[PDB]
Amino acid sequence: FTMKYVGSIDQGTTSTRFIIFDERQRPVSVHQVPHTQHTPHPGWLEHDPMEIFRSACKCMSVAIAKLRQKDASFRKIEAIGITNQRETTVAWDRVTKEPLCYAPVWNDLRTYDITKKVTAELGGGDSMFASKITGLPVSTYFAAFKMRWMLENVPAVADACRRGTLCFGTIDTWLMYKLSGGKAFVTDVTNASRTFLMDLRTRKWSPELCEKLKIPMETLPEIRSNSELFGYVETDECGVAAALNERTPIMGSIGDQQSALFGNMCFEKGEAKNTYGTGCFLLMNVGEEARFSKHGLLSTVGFQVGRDGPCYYALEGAIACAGATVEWMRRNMNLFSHITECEKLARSVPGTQGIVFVPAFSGLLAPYWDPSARGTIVGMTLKTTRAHVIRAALQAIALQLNDVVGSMKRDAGLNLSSLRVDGGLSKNGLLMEIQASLLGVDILVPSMHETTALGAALCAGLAAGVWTSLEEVKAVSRRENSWKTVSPSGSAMEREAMIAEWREALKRTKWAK
Amino acid sequence: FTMKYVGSIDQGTTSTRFIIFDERQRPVSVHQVPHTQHTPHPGWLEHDPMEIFRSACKCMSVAIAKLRQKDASFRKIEAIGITNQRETTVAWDRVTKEPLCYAPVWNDLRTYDITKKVTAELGGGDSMFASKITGLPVSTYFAAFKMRWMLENVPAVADACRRGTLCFGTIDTWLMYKLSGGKAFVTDVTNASRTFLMDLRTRKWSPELCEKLKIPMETLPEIRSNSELFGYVETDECGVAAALNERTPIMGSIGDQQSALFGNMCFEKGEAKNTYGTGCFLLMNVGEEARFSKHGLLSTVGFQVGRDGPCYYALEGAIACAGATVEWMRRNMNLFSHITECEKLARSVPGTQGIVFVPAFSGLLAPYWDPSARGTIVGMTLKTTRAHVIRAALQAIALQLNDVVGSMKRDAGLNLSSLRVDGGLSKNGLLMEIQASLLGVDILVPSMHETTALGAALCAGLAAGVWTSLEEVKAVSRRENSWKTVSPSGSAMEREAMIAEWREALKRTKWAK
């Protein structure tokens, strides 16, 4: 009858976008608004939730305005999905509806005491003691730890639970809270898998863990799926509520990294998405039973397309300096200028010729988690130019990743089928060819730029009937939104000798205080 | 009454220089002639002995001609001295006087196999097996090894030997051959030392080793002192006998690193010379009685003034790179553009932030004899930059010097008086600054640049009465030279710090193969 449109709120660390998709999953309108990165102490990071909510209302308000001008058939939105930076926690109150403090951000560290004050004590020295319930280790990321701090370092939050009005929520929950007026106080499985209070298997809260780490089982929202009806957009803030002419529902909510997988069409095990930037998140779809890991990797919910639908779980890995290495090799090293001499230089040489550049500048994340590791280059000769090191950096991004892949294989019990890539170096043709061969699978690269925001846009489409099933979601993406593939092109006397080289080069990374 | 003059042929690796000196020990005429550096295969290097010879002659002409223009007083030269690249070995013929084939240089590596058969079949295990006669390990550099490679690889060599016509010698004996026309077939202590067929203390052709590696006695030149009669320039090539208005004697012959030792006023033990250009060697005056070493350090002659003079021995200790590291960082790495920016950027930062460069590009030389070692960098952070590297680079140099000095200080029996510098990077404040620091001594940077050439003239000038004694030669030099010095800076707070890095840094260098 009409042309359908699904909106998505991409809620990043630094910026929040609002993106409107028409039913061929085209991005037809975008508006981006950044927000202040308050850093009260070296190691601390927080944001203003009422700033974010505002930014979001700006993007929504503007993206809708812009589209309304260039598309004569756009006349409302079927549903809105939310995707968000994970692990960021907000404190607030049912009856004021304001927030009670600035939200400590995922990588924010004010909680490293409570990290230890939980391992040495409540863990008998084992951070993994709960790795079977939560699918997580103890660390400075998950919403439980950041709640502990607000309860023990802010009276305004300490007082508000004394009351029994205090509300916690990762950004999603918070965003749907204000967007609906205060009505829905709700969350999804992917975000919930990161709170440290949740139960990998059953995807219900952990009264056991809520207990121990002492967060009342009712300062918390409810755990819903990824794709259902969460609520309705009833908030007049900025233009937004007006700009939507009928009561527009929220029908999709999903942690961004999981949204990146889901938006990359990874609905089946083997498939994996990898987002680059300064650093990476490689998430592999692992199937219908939560898989656990020995390499201290993360277990988490990939997605759930409906209140009690087939719940696909996932493993997760990170490296910390990917595009940041490609940045350092410029901003700090003179080795090149434009992102185009870089890939001309690296191709100017056939191989690396015996050298290994381990960009372990913060140490090794990935599968080796070794803080004693440092940036280290071995086996240089006089024959070593700058144009080799730069290729050996492209190898390093691929090689490190391979370890994470390797790891996942061992802890999944299946082979990486293919890999999708986005938001890091999708222009860098060479990296994908050095990457594709090594892993031994097809590396797929999307032409369309907004997979992450499509992730949540597809959770809200489905649930509203913009696309019928996940099987029809593949075909639309198969026909409209192009990919070109990058296919393997190397052999063992390269593929397996490089993996040997890397590891021989790894014993030489150590370099602590 | 008119000014007394003396010549020194300074036949290097890349080029032949001829320099005329007056009694104020000042260079008054100079001429440079380069010669082709043939690399017939990878890791080979040879020169035409005739090219070299003709260059020596074209150098004498111009230097004899320029001198007239400049100071018309000039009628003749008192004596000639010769200084040369050591270990390069020339095959020639006592009849035809032509070279039978080319000449493998000191850094040429065609003598690998031979070395192995030598420490195998003849040596029987230890590379130090003849080191109580030759004062040297069994390796590629030394001249017997190159001698035999020629006996059993060139058709014209052994065939000219079957007739007994064959003649051998390093450049100094070779140049002193065609200068006379054949008349003289001599060599001095410093070059003979380097051959591996001479006893270190008795300066005779090692009767055992002679027949052991097979090199017939007469194929070997008479062994003289550094400072005496040798032959007469009875050659007519580019009219040297002609241009030398009178009959000119040869009263100086000495290897170039010892001549640059002797040209820097290091007549008493504990004083050391550090030279640049192709390579970098430290040589410290050990004393009148030879001090043998256990570390891979070369015991060698320092100098012998006349038949019946005191022979100070010394210890060597090679290091390939100096301005080589800098050229790599510049050329290969594009880390900067001009050698102006090296010291700039390196000074332009406080320190190395816990990195260490190891510019062991073609192995690790010095007292740590390790060929598997390659160029490495350890300890990098996202805050490390292109200048922290350039800083680290120049610190790896002196730290390496340190250990060779520590090897001597040990095996020699004394500490360190003073050390002087010459070559491409002697004009480098920071370099001698760190070296002054690390070693704990004064470092004199000398105004008269070309002091290697001085050495041989000094052997020609003492022998010919132009100068009377070294202490007088010290006083003469004093009446012309300016001490641009650098002294130590720091305690254990700074010294044992970057060293501590150094030790463990090095412990991560073994890579090759």
Ligand SMILES: O=P(O)(O)OC[C@H](O)CO
């Ligand atoms: O001529 P150089 O400056 O390359 O020095 C080479 C050494 O004398 C070889 O022992």
